């Protein structure tokens, strides 16, 4: 019944969905608090970098990355924009349950 730490509980899933579709297994997700509230809650912004050691394109890639990454419970919504970005919009439920259960026992 404790919390978890969103932003490297994503980071470790995008990771993963990252190596999933080739990534290297020490590749960096590059998961970042959104710079605008139209982008979610959290940007995953590494996929760019990935598709260019892996010599493909960068929205490709991001599809790919979608297909092995399983959000639901966690984000109501995962868009890709631009060359690749990944835009998490955290679902409400979860965010206030990750917060109740980190003051529980307060």
Same mark, same amino acid.
């Given at each position: 019944?404790?919390?978890?730490?969103?932003?490297?509980? +994503?980071? #470790?899933? &995008?990771?993963?969905? %990252?190596?999933?579709? =080739?990534?290297?297994?020490?590749? $960096?997700?590059?998961?970042?608090?959104?710079?605008?509230?139209?982008?979610?809650?959290?940007?995953?912004?590494?996929?760019?970098?990935?598709?260019?050691?892996?010599?493909?394109?960068?929205?490709? +890639?991001? #599809?790919? &990355?979608?297909?092995? %990454?399983?959000?639901? =419970?966690?984000?109501?919504?995962? $868009?890709?924009?631009?060359?690749?970005?990944?835009?998490?919009?955290?679902?409400?439920?979860?965010?206030?349950?990750?917060?109740?259960?980190?003051?529980?026992?307060?």
């Amino acid at each position: 019944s404790n919390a978890m730490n969103i932003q490297a509980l +994503l980071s #470790e899933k &995008v990771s993963q969905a %990252l190596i999933a579709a =080739g990534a290297p297994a020490d590749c $960096e997700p590059q998961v970042r608090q959104s710079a605008k509230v139209q982008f979610g809650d959290y940007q995953a912004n590494g996929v760019m970098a990935v598709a260019k050691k892996l010599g493909m394109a960068p929205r490709q +890639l991001a #599809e790919q &990355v979608l297909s092995h %990454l399983d959000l639901n =419970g966690i984000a109501n919504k995962v $868009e890709i924009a631009g060359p690749g970005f990944i835009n998490i919009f955290l679902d409400p439920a979860f965010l206030a349950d990750n917060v109740n259960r980190a003051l529980q026992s307060e």
